[PDB]
Nucleic acid binder design. Structure first.
Ligand code: MN
Ligand code: MN
Length: 191
DNA sequence: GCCTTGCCGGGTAAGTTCCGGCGCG
DNA sequence: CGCGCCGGAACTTACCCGGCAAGGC
């Protein structure tokens, strides 16, 4: 559905390098935010924002994409109750993801949480269940993988993708054109 | 002798949650 | 009065990075 693939890719980025925030302020004021953070300005302005703006248009959400330059990172922010619950309800149903959504999400999550050298293929997160879900999808896609406690200091697990399956993982998941192609997958093959 | 990968420490690119503002019925 | 978009940025750590080495072929 392409809307579904982009949504799922975006959720991957959000759940990795952003978040979904229900805010209460004085009083009794509130706010609902959909957020992606990144150091890279290009990545946020040229790759992520156009994807988000498209999703906003098709959902007829009339909030704007904010870009705030913080001390350590840029924040792409959408202040929208509707978009907030759109991504939240999508997250609730994450185990129901079809194949295209699965691939797009994993794609998005790797851009956020992954080993970017590609010398190794690793996804970090403190959410073991999240990693396990991904792990099952990978297995079912013929991509072998293990999950371990990589960081004893902070409680961070890593999903390690077998180098024996480097090729399958990279061209099938990172270089798929069913979904938004990540920046140096769309550089990997116009090389 | 080369490769895969568990585990680890460094330190920054992430994430979370306050603030003040406005506009709406 | 009770909420929901805007604009910002202060506040801590969860990531990514890259080394080491045990194990395996
Ligand atoms: Mn994360
Ligand atoms: Mn990241």
């Amino acid at each position: 559905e392409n809307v579904s693939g982009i949504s799922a890719y975006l959720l991957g980025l959000i759940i990795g390098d952003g978040g979904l925030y229900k805010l209460k302020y004085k009083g009794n004021r509130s706010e609902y935010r959909v957020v992606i953070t990144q150091k890279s300005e290009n990545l946020i302005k040229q790759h992520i924002a156009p994807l988000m703006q498209f999703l906003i248009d098709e959902l007829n959400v009339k909030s704007k994409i904010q870009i705030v330059k913080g001390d350590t990172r840029y924040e792409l922010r959408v202040s929208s109750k509707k978009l907030y619950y759109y991504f939240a309800n999508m997250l609730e149903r994450i185990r129901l993801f079809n194949m295209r959504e699965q691939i797009a999400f994993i794609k998005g999550l790797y851009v956020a949480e992954g080993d970017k050298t590609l010398k190794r293929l690793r996804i970090w997160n403190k959410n073991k269940a999240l990693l396990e879900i991904v792990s099952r999808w990978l297995n079912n896609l013929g991509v072998r993988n293990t999950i371990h406690l990589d960081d004893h200091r902070h409680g961070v697990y890593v999903l390690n993708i077998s180098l024996r399956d480097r090729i399958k993982f990279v061209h099938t998941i990172l270089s798929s054109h069913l979904n938004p192609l990540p920046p140096e997958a769309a550089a990997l093959e116009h090389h």
